Design a protein around this ligand. Structure first.
Ligand SMILES: CCCCCCCCCO[C@@H]1O[C@H](CO)[C@@H](O)[C@H](O)[C@H]1O
Length: 175
């Protein structure tokens, strides 16, 4: 797995540990989306919310998905491609989550939705390239989506998905 796939995974584990130790609240105090005018200009906060996870279950699956999809995109398409997908989806989903439900949140699932969308759409319009989303894995990706949609936020997730579909569109549009 590439340097980008790895660094993100390691950081999510590190933050998660910092969260078990000092408690979630303390960590969010520093990494969460600005929750006061006084934090307005602390720029890392527009991205660092994707690094926090609140349950073993979430970071486990988010990282599995990230490891499979992110790794595939970085290897066949390059680190740069994964960095842009992650940056834009993290900002957009973070923004939509923030707008309808407040600054207290976290998770890499917004970015993960960008990846599922991207891998699947490129692999359907530009078969040729090695990046497609396995038939069986489309089924388990759906189950995962379902788990999330029926709370077993959805807006933040569609925004993440929208960034991925948009980018696969643009790409499978070059040639
Ligand atoms: C979707 C994943 C997003 C991850 C984004 C991580 C960005 C971390 C930016 O931190 C910066 O690191 C510098 C290193 O020296 C500090 O000096 C500076 O104060 C701090 O702002």
């Amino acid at each position: 797995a590439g340097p980008v796939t790895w660094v993100m995974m390691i950081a999510c584990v590190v933050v998660f540990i910092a969260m078990q130790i000092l408690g979630d609240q303390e960590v969010m105090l520093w990494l969460a989306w600005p929750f006061d005018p006084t934090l307005k200009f602390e720029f890392w906060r527009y991205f660092t919310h994707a690094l926090m996870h609140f349950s073993l279950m979430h970071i486990l699956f988010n990282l599995l998905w990230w490891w499979y999809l992110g790794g595939a995109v970085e290897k066949r398409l390059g680190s740069g491609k994964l960095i842009v997908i992650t940056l834009i989806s993290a900002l957009l989903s973070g923004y939509v989550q923030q707008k309808f439900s407040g600054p207290w949140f976290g998770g890499l699932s917004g970015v993960v939705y960008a990846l599922m969308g991207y891998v699947w759409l490129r692999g359907e319009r530009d078969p040729q390239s090695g990046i497609y989303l396995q038939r069986g894995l489309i089924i388990f990706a759906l189950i995962w989506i379902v788990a999330g949609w029926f709370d077993l936020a959805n807006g933040a997730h569609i925004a993440g998905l929208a960034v991925g579909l948009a980018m696969a569109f643009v790409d499978s549009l070059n040639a």
